[PDB]
Amino acid sequence: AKQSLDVSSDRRKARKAYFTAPSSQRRVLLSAPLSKELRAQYGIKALPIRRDDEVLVVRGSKKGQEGKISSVYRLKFAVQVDKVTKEKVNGASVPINLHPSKLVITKLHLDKDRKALIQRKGGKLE
RNA sequence: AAACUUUCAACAACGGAUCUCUUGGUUCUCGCAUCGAUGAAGAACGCAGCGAAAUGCGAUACGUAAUGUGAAUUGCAGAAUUCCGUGAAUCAUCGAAUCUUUGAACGCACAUUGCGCCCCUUGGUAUUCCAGGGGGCAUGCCUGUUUGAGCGUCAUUU
Ligand SMILES: [Mg+2]
Ligand SMILES: [Mg+2]
Ligand SMILES: [Mg+2]
Ligand SMILES: [Mg+2]
Ligand SMILES: [Mg+2]
Ligand SMILES: [Mg+2]
Ligand SMILES: [Mg+2]
Ligand SMILES: [Mg+2]
Ligand SMILES: [Mg+2]
Ligand SMILES: [Mg+2]
Ligand SMILES: [Mg+2]
Ligand SMILES: [Mg+2]
Ligand SMILES: [Mg+2]
Ligand SMILES: [Mg+2]
Ligand SMILES: [Mg+2]
């Protein structure tokens, strides 16, 4: 239950705040949990998702597939992961949009800001 | 007997009801006090690699700076060794700037993209003419400054 008179339980307001979120807010909204191995290694549970992250799909119809995130398509709230495609009938190959909450990060793209982000969230960085 | 006409069903039409949704409205409550001659509200015209609008901006033109975040944007195209970085982004924030023609709108005028005058500077053999660049020139009122006007009026003068 809500205890503060600053946040809203209004469903209409929550949906406007989701669907009209700018990209810097959608980055936090498009978070993805880590794997068992990375959660043991880094001490933290979920991070905002990145391009060069390696992921495993754990839901839907492409579950159990691997790849690198080809694109974080924040305008569609989606991630496009290579090796996860739809073969069209003309021979074209279109990327299937995935949600990061149905993904599991199995290898992070680490740089200085990601390391500081892990340490900020309390992570082991090991 | 058909055709025709009528009724009913199924399927197909016409049409967009019903149901289920909802980034909208409505009403109540709480908190706050902030437009403009330092040029507002409003208007017109423009601005994007491909845009008519909406939204945003002003010839620095869907923006510049600065700061925070930290890798997007994307409908295509392009750029993406910049990506362990004073650093992507139609991102957030926003204290520095720009801000066309206007508009209370302020040289005058305006059904004109009309006509002046002043200063500095530049070019044309130029203080005077023509041109370009920059800066000015409204009204009422207040305080002050300077220059004045009035036998309104006081001293001082062979
Ligand atoms: Mg990070
Ligand atoms: Mg009301
Ligand atoms: Mg203006
Ligand atoms: Mg205005
Ligand atoms: Mg209008
Ligand atoms: Mg433009
Ligand atoms: Mg437009
Ligand atoms: Mg600019
Ligand atoms: Mg940007
Ligand atoms: Mg913005
Ligand atoms: Mg300018
Ligand atoms: Mg402006
Ligand atoms: Mg005239
Ligand atoms: Mg005329
Ligand atoms: Mg006066």
What DSSP assignment string belongs to chain A? ----SSS---HHHHHHHHHT--HHHHHHHSEEEB-HHHHHHHS-SEEE--SS-EEEE-SSSSTT-EEEEEEEEGGGTEEEEEEEEEE-TTS-EEEEEE-GGGEEEEE----HHHHHHHHHHT----
CB of A110 within 7 Å of some strand B atom:
yes
Maximum CA extent, chain A: 56
Long-range contacts of range A70-79, CB-CB < 8 Å, 24 or more positions apart? A70/A95, A71/A95, A72/A27, A72/A30, A73/A97, A74/A23, A74/A26, A74/A27, A74/A30, A75/A23, A77/A26, A77/A29, A77/A30, A79/A30, A79/A32, A79/A49, A79/A55, A79/A103
CB of A43 within 7 Å of some strand B atom:
no
Residue reference for tokens 């307001």: A13
Phi–psi pair at A90, nearest 5 degrees: -85, 5
CA quadruple A77, A80, A81, A86: dihedral sign: positive
Please enumerate in sequence order all residues whose Cβ is within 8 A of that of A94, keeping only pairs 6 or more positions apart, or say none.
A85, A86, A88
- How many other CB atoms are there within 10 angstroms of residue A85's CB atom? 16
Residue reference for tokens 């990209």: A23
Cβ atoms of A100 and A49 within 8 Å: the answer is: yes
Nearest nucleotide to A111, CA against C1' atoms: B84
CA quadruple A12, A100, A38, A117: dihedral sign: negative
Question: Which amino acid, residue A5?
Answer: L
Distance of CA A40 to the CA centre of its chain: 19
CA distance A122 to A120: 5
CB of A56 within 7 Å of some strand B atom:
no
